[PDB]
Amino acid sequence: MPAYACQRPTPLTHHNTGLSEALEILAEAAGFEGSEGRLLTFCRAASVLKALPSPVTTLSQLQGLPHFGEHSSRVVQELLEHGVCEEVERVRRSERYQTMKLFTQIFGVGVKTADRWYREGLRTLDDLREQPQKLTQQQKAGLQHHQDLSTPVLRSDVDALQQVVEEAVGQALPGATVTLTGGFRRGKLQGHDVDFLITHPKEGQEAGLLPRVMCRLQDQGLILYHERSFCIFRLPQPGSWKAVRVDLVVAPVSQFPFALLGWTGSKLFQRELRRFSRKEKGLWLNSHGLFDPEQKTFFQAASEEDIFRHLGLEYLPPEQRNA
DNA sequence: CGGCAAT
DNA sequence: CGTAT
DNA sequence: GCCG
Ligand SMILES: [Cl-]
Ligand SMILES: [Cl-]
Ligand SMILES: [Cl-]
Ligand code: NA
Ligand code: NA
Ligand code: NA
């Protein structure tokens, strides 16, 4: 199979869930130690298993597979033979991993901040609440709605939110469209947030749209916290409500297919796609466009299909970008 | 060994 | 530093 | 951690 994740279809569900989940724990643990190189490899190795057409049953089936060296193969070997991987289980139990994972999942908290808190003796959320003086407003909101934000967002929630966003956007700018992106566009049934991409058919009209959208959303009393906009929405529930992370992104229609591709993901898929573009095609890709450094020109795109064709890749629908 | 996406 | 895919 |  191809070495780049953007060269292979990766469905949301596959046939090596257990194996890939173990490797991603090591990737997650690697990122907690600042080992971005090791995180990347373990992520790649896990994605390879996701792309396989059938379960891995023997170690010999790992031969030839990209990004599977000594360490990753050792992990799979133990899992196939003993049902568990000793290193993986040791990571799970450790106070370091559980704390870092707990801290980093807080909105407004990254690895660097989490590590510093761990080195100061902080272990729980109430520890962070015990000293609100050294908390930023984004972190204060992160701890404030942490329980709700830790609750999976369902498809039914997305539909309600999109109906809300479309209403505000529509009143903010006639003709402006709202596109669901993120993991939910890839076909996920549950998520930790909702991502929307907003544009307008007439180039330039999308300028200064977000403040108008946010104002009309706040007027409806739907914003607990907030061109991009990282918001925490108040989502109506049966007899109550819960907080939901929502991201609003505005782009000109000329750059829309690039913004759509980037914000649909997955994270690893986009990294592999941009790595492929530069290393194999000598082209520079981001959320805004595709640049030819030699010709000093930007590729024009009307769709995601255009971009894939520019890069010489077979088209992959969003539901096959779950790398 | 240098690179690892990109803003 | 944080945020997004 | 893996790759060229
Ligand atoms: Cl590393
Ligand atoms: Cl899902
Ligand atoms: Cl498109
Ligand atoms: Na976080
Ligand atoms: Na998001
Ligand atoms: Na998301």
Return d(Cα A42, Cα A19) in angstroms, integer: 11
What residues of A are labeled active site? Answer: 193, 195, 247
* Cis, peptide link before residue A266, omega less than 30° from 0: yes
Residues with CB under 7 A from strand B: A 36-37, 40-41, 267, 270-272, 274-275, 277-278, 284-288
Q: What is the CATH number of domain A1-94?
A: 1.10.150.110
Amino acid at A115: D
- Look at chain A and count its residues: 323
Q: Quick one: tokens of A270? A: 């986009």
Please count the CA atoms within 13 angstroms of the CA of A228 that sit on its side-chain side: 8
Parallel, antiparallel, or unpaired: how do β-strands A194-199 and A240-250 relate? parallel
Within 8 A by CB and 6+ apart from A220, the residues are A164, A168
Q: Tell me the fold of A152-253.
A: Beta Polymerase; domain 2 (3.30.460)
Ligand 5 is an ion; residues with CB less than 5 A from it: A 193, 195, 247
CATH homologous superfamily of A95-151 equals 5' to 3' exonuclease, C-terminal subdomain (1.10.150.20)
**Considering only CA atoms, which of A234, A258, A263, A260 is closest in space to residue A247?**
A263
Provide, in whole angstroms, the distance separating residue A26's CA from nucleotide D2's C1': 14
Distance CA A97, CA A270 (A): 26
A277 CA: nearest nucleotide by C1': B5
Parts of chain A belonging to CATH 1.10.150.20:
95-151
Backbone angles phi and psi of A91, in degrees to 5 = -70, -45
State in Å: Cα A291 to ligand 6 middle.
27
- Rounded alpha-carbon distances, angstroms, from residue A14 to A49, A51, A125: 8, 7, 35
- Write out the DSSP string of A247-306: EEEE--TTTHHHHHHHHH--HHHHHHHHHHHHHHH--EE-SS-EEETTTTEEPP-SSHHH
CB distance A213 to A248 below 8 Å: yes
Looking at residue A176, the DSSP 8-state letter turns out to be -
Cβ atoms < 10 Å from Cβ of A193: 18
Closest to A138 (Cα-Cα) out of A225, A44, A253, A219: A225
Q: How much distance in Å is there from the Cα of A42 to the middle of ligand 1?
A: 11
Sheet holding A240-250, edge to edge: A177-180, A194-199, A240-250, A228-237, A223-225
A175 Cβ contact partners less than 8 Å away, ≥ 6 residues apart: A200, A201, A202, A205
Token code pair at residue A284: 């520079």
Experimental method: X-ray
| A68: three-class secondary structure by DSSP | coil
Rounded distance from Cα A29 to ligand 1 centre (Å): 11
User: Residue A227 gets which letter from DSSP?
Assistant: -
Half-sphere exposure of A14 (CA within 13 A, CB side): 26
* Contact criterion met (CB below 8 Å) for A269 and A313: no
Boundaries of CATH 3.30.460.10 in chain A?
A: 152-253
**Measuring CA to CA, how many Å separate A76 from each of A42, A87, A114?**
12, 11, 30
Binning chain A into helix, strand and coil, the percentages to the nearest 5 are 50, 15, 35
- Note the CA–C1' distance, A229 to B3, in angstroms: 32
Which one is the CATH code of A254-322: 3.30.210.10, 3.20.20.70, 3.30.2130.10, 3.40.50.150?
3.30.210.10
Q: Which two tokens stand for residue A249?
A: 């992104």
Secondary structure letter of residue A151 according to DSSP? S
Residue A152 per-residue DSSP state: P
CA nearest neighbour of A232 among A143, A102, A155, A100 = A143
Using the C1' atom of nucleotide D2, identify the protein residue whose alpha carbon is closest.
A67
Give chain D positions with protein CB within 7 A. Answer: 1-4
